Amino acid sequence: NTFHVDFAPNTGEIFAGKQPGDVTMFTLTMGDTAPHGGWRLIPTGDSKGGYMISADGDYVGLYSYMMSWVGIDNNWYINDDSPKDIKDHLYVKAGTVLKPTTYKFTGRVEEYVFDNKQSTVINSKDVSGEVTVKQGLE
């Protein structure tokens, strides 16, 4: 139906070492023309807390442009009631060291409405993806 969510790895290449600037790991598009109050992304499994987890066992924090992180609630959220798509990127900060391995994210997107000074979920979707960082030519 009207609710839609698309979570994908970035369509380009990520290279190992110190990131020379903020680097997008994943894109998140979500929208609904039906009435609603906002959206949240809840990291699940080993991503709990807002992390990617690498095949080497390292946790790397992710940041959002469009959403705000609330650690109390293990979620990013944005309050938006418009019918237009929200286009966000989850990124790693400039200077972050990445290793040439696979980094995974798993989470759940929820769309919610407001009532009784709180909120109620009206739709949800599990999302996941991975980026395999390349060494680059040496």
Ligand SMILES: OC[C@H]1O[C@@H](O)[C@H](O)[C@@H](O)[C@H]1O
């Ligand atoms: O304003 C609504 C938001 O409130 C935050 O405190 C919560 O973590 C989000 O999930 C969302 O419900």
Ligand SMILES: [Br-]
């Ligand atoms: Br969908």
Ligand SMILES: [Br-]
């Ligand atoms: Br998806």
Ligand SMILES: [Br-]
């Ligand atoms: Br979509």
Ligand SMILES: [Br-]
């Ligand atoms: Br691609």
Ligand SMILES: [Br-]
């Ligand atoms: Br790739």
Ligand SMILES: [Br-]
């Ligand atoms: Br680079």
Ligand SMILES: [Br-]
């Ligand atoms: Br997307």
Ligand SMILES: [Br-]
């Ligand atoms: Br509609």
Ligand SMILES: [Br-]
């Ligand atoms: Br979980």
Ligand SMILES: [Br-]
């Ligand atoms: Br290692």
Ligand SMILES: [Br-]
């Ligand atoms: Br770590």
Ligand SMILES: [Br-]
């Ligand atoms: Br953030």
Ligand SMILES: [Br-]
């Ligand atoms: Br936090």
Ligand SMILES: [Br-]
């Ligand atoms: Br917090």
Ligand SMILES: [Br-]
């Ligand atoms: Br609380």
